[PDB]
Design a protein around this ligand. Structure first.
Ligand SMILES: [Mg+2]
Ligand SMILES: [Mg+2]
Ligand SMILES: [Mg+2]
Ligand SMILES: [Mg+2]
Ligand SMILES: [Mg+2]
Ligand SMILES: [Mg+2]
Ligand SMILES: [Mg+2]
Ligand SMILES: [Mg+2]
Ligand SMILES: [Mg+2]
Ligand SMILES: [Mg+2]
Ligand SMILES: [Mg+2]
Ligand SMILES: [Mg+2]
Ligand SMILES: [Mg+2]
Ligand SMILES: [Mg+2]
Ligand SMILES: [Mg+2]
Ligand SMILES: [Mg+2]
Ligand SMILES: [Mg+2]
Ligand SMILES: [Mg+2]
Ligand SMILES: [Mg+2]
Ligand SMILES: [Mg+2]
Ligand SMILES: [Mg+2]
Lengths: 178, 178, 176, 176, 178, 176
């Protein structure tokens, strides 16, 4: 019944994916999906007084180079609740290494918030906002002794290539028969 | 595992029903239950800076003329979280057409909040509050080009007739064997 | 000390003005600065479940055709508290009438939030956001039996010429 | 400017009074207006996980048997910010003693929230809500070793006669 | 699919247990897990303007003398959402009778909030905080006519004995085969 | 009335000081008291998704090496509103430089929250909490290109000697 395994990656992949939100914007508690049960679990409380700048979660039925479900960040005006499904349009991708692992993260906007109707690529996002997101990931685990390195941002096309790669990695990981 | 299908319509229908809340009072995000999975899903962000004036959701194992689960609005002092069950006493019904469809909505109070112990019928509700609810539905989809028409309010008896009709429509819709 | 009279209209008028916020984004309570004392006052509770879509207030030492200080709307990500001063860059103006009075409202962004650094004119705002603000003013007083008429949006140059006109109306009214 | 002394008790005393809110509904921090400066001050943090069930404050230019401004409770759907003025219609009065002093508290509704238009007397309030307010005052200082004694609720006519008495106590105390 | 039955009591019982949170700190709504479905349900609205001083919930696969899942209180700086799993370190136990029933409650801290790293026993908690918790339970059902009696606090060792007893009572209650 | 100048530094300096809060815990908006008028002003929005980990403000009638009122951080469970006065017991001091200026900050607890009754010195604070505060100041202005240097934490005795020094700097600056 774990929604990570049960939900499809999206209704029109990779143009529109499902984002399963784990962490609402504004939260200092780092939630994740419990792997066994699919419940929400507290992974940690962030060691610094930082908050997630985006709603944050995973794309169902994906896996990635870092040995986790593929991360997705959805820009929401009003945060959602954990375990909410958002139909999301990928617009770019944050390129980072986290303790040496290729922990990249899709950046997306909600299809059904008209505020974002003309946001289709990484160039549509205010620079200071991209900088704030990157800085969060650069520093949020500094007090835990972790080395993170932000490479930069890729465009919507690159995000979509990576989503398709992650859908394939899930099939290989869990032995899914086409 | 979709709670819309699994939960009973109520413990003492139609005098007391279960309200499965999708949208907490105060939310501009319009959540609904995903039909396939039963997870919470973002349907849309409202196009106007309005908020749901009531906790809003559905009665399990109901269906209605508009091709959806039967809508219920519960008056709560402190909003609940999405996917919370409230034992609710129907006190009236909002009569409206939404794009030509008979989209009526039960108005109810929580059985277990003593604040509302003497609220048993539509006449117990402040007029301005009924007007605020009606006005929300009159205008919340105006920027989406939708025609809605508020007819008025029915009493507790009429709400209860409609609940029993909706319980029957669900059985017919999903081929339930008595 | 009544901040409407004590504060200047801005540090670099009309390119940068001071916005004295009365109503934080997200409020359904309609607060105003009390004319007499300068304290925050509850004017009303909105009759509908609407909330202010922007941080809303006044430009100090202004007056306007509707017999009030000139209104200003500041787009803020995190709302401020009532009676907070924000250095604000006008980027456009909502043209409307309220109960038959000309009641236009400046739209502005905070100078000191870098998110908005490239917002300089009305074309920089998402359409749907302008539509949501206009719709709020179109309908928020409907249950009070009041009529508003929304004309549309003017640009930053219009907004600035209106700010100057409102500064001179304050001198006309209170000056001397 | 100390608003307790500067503001009038009301626009139409005792039918409509001004409530100067100190504590928004939902607070566990007990704020007061500082006697000296008129700024908001933290008096204490309540010793128990209780929150004020009403917007709580004072009527300006009043005094009372307990050596404080006369207390007022305003029922608000959305809480206000501290130091907000609310035009309030008294509808009853909580009769209690606090540490042996007569410390009654007016119960009022906002004139400008139409939700409360038909709330005019103590019989218009749900019983359970009156019970919750009384229980708050019965127990909120228990861990401080303080004794409160709740007598019961008086009606709107009592409340108004007490407001007039408190207005005259302010003149007795500060008058001249 | 009821997580009370599906989740294990903890990853390292009784030193570390899972706390399944029902009620976030700050809530006046008293939520519980629906027994049949595992959904969140509104049990009541508290009759007084009190709020839960701790995140409050249950340890999975436990049962207690009072005929309920064993209660656990987790001290969180930022409240979690209902149905969140917290890995929790027991540090003491609140001893109370509620309408004559032995309704004791584990007090615990999150393993993964470093703020609490040196909280290991009841003596690490500020006295006023223990007093506030006890006073809440002493008075929160006073308007419902219920007699509650707070005995005091036991230490971490006693809390852990009681957790193991509750794990056994669950096996006996639901006929679990070792 | 500008509370920075009007309020005294404390009721029992330096054992108990008045903290005039500018920024509630949890804010990303950086508010300050306006030097001119004493109103709350938005100085900036922090460039990163950081929030103030403490209620943050100033001690009235103090001045400091960095050309500002002396900063104070009050640990509060429930944040206060801006411009609230809190009676605060200093328990330590964050030693840092900001853009090359000595910009130390008192750490204090509220006298009137019994939760903190046994917090009297810097050793009473959880390590991780001191680390989180220091890290906030280490990184919160990084995207503004500003350099801060965190030296470490001093104890209650240091903090109190600094408060006295800051009280005398105010007299040096404004005195007369
Ligand atoms: Mg994750
Ligand atoms: Mg990682
Ligand atoms: Mg990853
Ligand atoms: Mg629905
Ligand atoms: Mg419809
Ligand atoms: Mg319907
Ligand atoms: Mg007008
Ligand atoms: Mg107007
Ligand atoms: Mg006209
Ligand atoms: Mg106007
Ligand atoms: Mg007294
Ligand atoms: Mg008293
Ligand atoms: Mg006496
Ligand atoms: Mg009194
Ligand atoms: Mg329970
Ligand atoms: Mg019990
Ligand atoms: Mg129990
Ligand atoms: Mg400096
Ligand atoms: Mg500095
Ligand atoms: Mg230097
Ligand atoms: Mg400084």
């Amino acid at each position: 019944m774990n929604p990570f395994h049960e939900l499809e990656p999206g209704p029109e992949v990779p143009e529109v994916v499902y984002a399963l939100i784990e962490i609402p914007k504004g939260s200092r508690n780092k939630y994740e999906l419990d792997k066994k049960t699919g419940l929400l679990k507290l992974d940690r409380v962030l060691y610094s007084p930082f908050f997630y700048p985006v709603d944050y979660g995973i794309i169902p039925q994906t896996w990635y180079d870092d040995g986790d479900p593929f991360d997705i960040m959805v820009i929401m005006r009003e945060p959602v609740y954990p375990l909410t499904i958002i139909e999301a349009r990928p617009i770019g991708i944050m390129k980072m290494e986290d303790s040496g692992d290729k922990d990249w993260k899709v950046l997306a906007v909600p299809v059904e918030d008209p505020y974002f109707n003309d946001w289709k690529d990484i160039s549509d996002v205010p620079k200071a906002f991209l900088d704030e997101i990157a800085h969060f990931f650069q520093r949020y685990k500094e007090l835990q002794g972790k080395t993170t390195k932000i490479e930069g941002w890729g465009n919507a096309e690159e995000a979509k290539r990576e989503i398709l790669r992650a859908i394939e990695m899930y099939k290989e990981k869990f032995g899914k028969e086409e």
